């Protein structure tokens, strides 16, 4: 979504993020994700990948590379080498 292209815009969507979820808005927004307003469902502004069921210790960048490795925002921020590693390529 076009209005979620900035980190600050994505941070504003976490207004009603449930406080019990063990991952923080700053981590999520940095990795491209904004809150869609249901449970702990987030989506990437670039690739539209959705992630939910966040667990203690999850790193949103690693999860983004695990499930949505072709995302261009992810590749530009973290690099193809990182994404390849998370996909089991060295």
């Amino acid at each position: 979504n076009l209005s979620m292209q900035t980190h600050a815009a994505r941070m504003r969507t976490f207004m009603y993020w449930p406080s019990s979820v063990p991952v923080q808005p700053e981590q999520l927004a940095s990795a491209g994700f904004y809150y869609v307003g249901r449970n702990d469902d987030v989506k990437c502004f670039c690739c539209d990948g959705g992630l939910r069921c966040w667990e203690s210790g999850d790193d949103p960048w690693v999860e983004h590379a695990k499930w949505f490795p072709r995302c261009e925002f992810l590749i530009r921020m973290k690099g193809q080498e990182f994404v390849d590693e998370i996909q089991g390529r060295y």
Partner: peptide, 4 residues
């Protein structure tokens, strides 16, 4: 996390 899990994808959708």
């Amino acid at each position: 996390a899990t994808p959708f």
